[PDB]
Amino acid sequence: SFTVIIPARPMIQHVFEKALQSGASRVIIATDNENVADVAKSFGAEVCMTSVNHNSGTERLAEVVEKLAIPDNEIIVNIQGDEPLIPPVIVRQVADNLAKFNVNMASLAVKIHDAEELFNPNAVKVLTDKDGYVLYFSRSVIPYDRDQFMNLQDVQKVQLSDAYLRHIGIYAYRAGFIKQYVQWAPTQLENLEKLEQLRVLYNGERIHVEL
Ligand SMILES: Nc1ccn([C@@H]2O[C@H](COP(=O)(O)O[C@@]3(C(=O)O)C[C@@H](O)[C@@H](O)[C@@H]([C@H](O)CO)O3)[C@@H](O)[C@H]2O)c(=O)n1
Numbered sequence: 001s002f003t004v005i006i007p008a009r010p011m012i013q014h015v016f017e018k019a020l021q022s023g024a025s026r027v028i029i030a031t032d033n034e035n036v037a038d039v040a041k042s043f044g045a046e047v048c049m050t051s052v053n054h055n056s057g058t059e060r061l062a063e064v065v066e067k068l069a070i071p072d073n074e075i076i077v078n079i080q081g082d083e084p085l086i087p088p089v090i091v092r093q094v095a096d097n098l099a100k101f102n103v104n105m106a107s108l109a110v111k112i113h114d115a116e117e118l119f120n121p122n123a124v125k126v127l128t129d130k131d132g133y134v135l136y137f138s139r140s141v142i143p144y145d146r147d148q149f150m151n152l153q154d155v156q157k158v159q160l161s162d163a164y165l166r167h168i169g170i171y172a173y174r175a176g177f178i179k180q181y182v183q184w185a186p187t188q189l190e191n192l193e194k195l196e197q198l199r200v201l202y203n204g205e206r207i208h209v210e211l
Pocket residue numbers: 007008009054055056057060080081082123124167168169194195196197
């Protein structure tokens with residue numbers, strides 16, 4: 001029974017329409033610009049004006065849940081306004097993962113098939129435990145393949161033995177958590193890597209990442 005919020009600081013329309021297929025019972029475009037608000041409104045969207053003063057989608061969602069009075073317990077699925085494609089079915093998966101795996105933040109990943117993105121700092125790497133509980137997210141390749149990378153010359157000699165995972169920009173969290181998230185001070189960790197999800201891990205909170 002989730003609600004979708006798309007942080008949007010036409011690309012957005014695709015996220016928007018992919019969102020509609022998700023089964024979301026509400027899809028809001030979160031923006032900080034009149035031009036985006038109007039454009040968003042032009043494709044039949046509920047819009048929420050937010051301030052410029054947010055360094056992350058999660059942070060912007062916090063204001064959105066306040067302004068709209070989204071009840072604490074409502075499940076919010078942040079679908080970053082830059083998402084390539086989302087089999088909408090997955091969105092329902094992550095949302096239900098909150099209670100399935102007993103966590104305040106659920107997310108998703110995809111099996112990496114090209115090794116060149118292992119080493120791309122804009123391709124965020126994620127790695128979990130046996131149940132999908134995240135160990136760490138990084139712009140650096142994780143895990144490290146000592147035997148293949150130690151004095152590695154060709155990215156194409158690299159054998160990705162189903163070890164690698166690329167993080168997708170979709171979060172599932174109840175409004176109340178987004179409020180808590182932003183009640184935490186920004187971390188050095190999230191700020192070095194520029195990855196909002198690292199505030200949850202740093203605050204001793206766990207994250208679930210589904211394949
Ligand atoms: N101050 C900001 C910055 C971003 N956004 C919203 O956040 C999304 C940005 O996604 P991103 O910038 O592409 O996101 C990152 C990224 O670094 O690409 C950031 C990071 O927090 C983390 O969530 C990773 C994921 O790991 C997905 O790779 O995704 C955009 O839709 C934007 O409108 C925002 O509202 N306000």
